[model samples]
Target: TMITPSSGNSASGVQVADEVCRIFYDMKVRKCSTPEEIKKRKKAVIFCLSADKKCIIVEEGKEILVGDVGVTITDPFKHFVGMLPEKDCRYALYDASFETKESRKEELMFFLWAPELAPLKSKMIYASSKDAIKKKFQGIKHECQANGPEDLNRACIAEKLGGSLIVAFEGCPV
Candidate 1:
């Protein structure tokens, strides 16, 4: 039942924490460097409101509680999807790669993952607080607000990428 201040120093009354900003900046730099290297990289990142609901932070899984999150050159898209709780919501950024007749293309997709079964309070909170983090993620190419499994499927994501065929994430079978 806590309400954040509106029209103050923060937008949506939610703070996008420093850690999230740092990681987001690194990702943006990587986005620009992809052409020089064909190696794998993080395919996506997940963010969530803090336990107190005052700030947005990275979802670093259950094992780690302190320090910077590790960067792995692996496609964690499937893992990212798995982390989306059925009864909650999260903000995510995905790096989408496509195979087109013209050439391979990469695009960054922002996600508002609010599931159908999540509480209305959380759904509303996430929806309203989206811009707080979005303002920090400059140059993101696309946005998807998903409330169902169908919305998160490959076909739908492809459509968001303007109907390009998404390349399979590294190492997992197509």
Candidate 2:
């Protein structure tokens, strides 16, 4: 679905893009433009809001995934009173920015990142555990049965799974 981000996409760009990217990221990409394979594991989740504040990604899902910063529990589409492009529209700014777990205890924390926001190359997002994300953030109480730490603290893993995240390309979780 290749659509253009018109001035029309401005109002709901926040609504549509936030809704779209949240879900789009929850699921992930396997074989790439290079035709290699990658697997995703939730060693850490870093919630990256564009440092420019021009954009921020929203995530709402029933399942937790690998490398996801957190879960929104509520599906983003529900809040979408506006419309979204059905096709050819790149969700942009999505990427596999980092693939490292600094230590252990620093795993579960509010690790936000800056956007490389351009056009969507990676069409999906994955998390290791939705339960882990909800658990870590007390403010995010809508996480259903899943729950964890305190706040997503920085420079620490807090809940140490002690594993590096590996994005697998077995198939699609969608």
Candidate 3:
């Protein structure tokens, strides 16, 4: 399988290239302008499986495992909520399941890449008020898990907070 970076967007393309190289040592499929070349090169097609496992390219008939190149992160609910302010505040969390382990791992990597958690710290500072931050964070969590680590971590945190969050994909537990 070959993973190629998208063109026309320098920042996103670089980020995609970095992510693909980080996970796989295969050749970097350069962006092609011609439809014929793209169609002829089966591996040139990019399938964004998840954040950490972004842009997966494979032979036309190749198959990939769910955990083939993915990662997972799970924690208790209380621990998740504990990251919030001590004072009472309104918050919501959601859970999602993925179909591939590579996708899951990519998602986790993206979560860790988020501005707040990118530094490897638990604290997150939103531009909006505390309540807004909570809502936005939840939204981001939902968006992140809607497709992909972050899912497991969100579930684990929900569990730690006395709620149940389950992240699974194609019957695989997270």
The best candidate by lDDT is 1
Task: Tell me the spans in candidate 3 whose CA falls farther than 4 Å from its real position.
Answer: 1-68, 71-171
lDDT of 1 by residue, 58-79 (tens): 5445111111122322333444
Q: Evaluate all candidate structures by whole-model CA lDDT and list the values in order.
A: 0.51, 0.23, 0.25
TM-score, cand. 3: 0.19
lDDT of 3 by residue, 64-163 (tens): 2122122222322222223222221111221222323233322211122122222111112211122332222332323222111243353443342213
Report the poorest 10 consecutive residues by lDDT, candidate 3: 119-128
- Estimate the lDDT of model 3: 0.25
lDDT of 3 at 103: 38
Model 2 C-alpha lDDT per residue in residues 68-156, reported as the tens digit of each score = 33233121111111111212121211222222333111111222121234223112221222222223333321121111111111111
Per-candidate TM equals 0.64, 0.19, 0.19
Positional deviation of residue 46's Cα in model 2 after best superposition, in angstroms? 3.5
Task: Identify the leading candidate in terms of TM-score.
Answer: 1
